[PDB]
Design a protein around this ligand. Structure first.
Ligand SMILES: [Ca+2]
Ligand SMILES: [Ca+2]
Ligand SMILES: [Ca+2]
Ligand SMILES: [Ca+2]
Lengths: 22, 148
């Protein structure tokens, strides 16, 4: 259950972060 | 960095599978982009190319399983539960009502190509919802983010 949270959570977090660095 | 723990590696391991539908052990631009874009976002190809090129240590135009850990590891290092949750909470909360319902959470989850059932969604919210109101709030979101 917690794993799923990390997935969507990290997915959105990394997207905004990685894209921002651009 | 150059030293990733088995904890973060495992987290991306599961997520990696959720991203690698063909389980070929490698992620392509179309894949990483398709899943990412599914997050209710419509980033331009230039945004994706740059995203990959950044982690693409070899600039081969593709990222392998190992490289994937790098992308997640990069953000995991500066994990800002503050902004991270804020932006994430907004993505899941389309109506911006401040509360995440099963319908929404299930929708975004399905976008990633993940097949979750009503029972799984309910457990996710219930397990994340301290009050058990059938929804997840911002405070509950951070509380659920507990690594334990
Ligand atoms: Ca693949
Ligand atoms: Ca590469
Ligand atoms: Ca909502
Ligand atoms: Ca709640």
């Amino acid at each position: 259950a917690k794993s799923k949270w990390k997935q969507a959570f990290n997915a959105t977090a990394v997207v905004r972060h990685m894209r921002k660095l651009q | 960095a150059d030293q990733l723990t088995e904890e973060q590696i495992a987290e991306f391991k599961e997520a990696f599978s959720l991203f690698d539908k063909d389980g070929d052990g490698t992620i392509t631009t179309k894949e990483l982009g398709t899943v990412m874009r599914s997050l209710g976002q419509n980033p331009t190809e230039a945004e994706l190319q740059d995203m990959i090129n950044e982690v693409d240590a070899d600039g081969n135009g593709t990222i392998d399983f190992p490289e994937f850990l790098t992308m997640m590891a990069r953000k995991m290092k500066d994990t800002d539960s503050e902004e991270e949750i804020r932006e994430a909470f907004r993505v899941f909360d389309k109506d911006g009502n401040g509360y995440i319902s099963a319908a929404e959470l299930r929708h975004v989850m399905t976008n990633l190509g993940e097949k979750l059932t009503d029972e799984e969604v309910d457990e996710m919210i219930r397990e994340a919802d301290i009050d058990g109101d059938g929804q997840v709030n911002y405070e509950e979101f951070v509380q659920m983010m507990t690594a334990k």
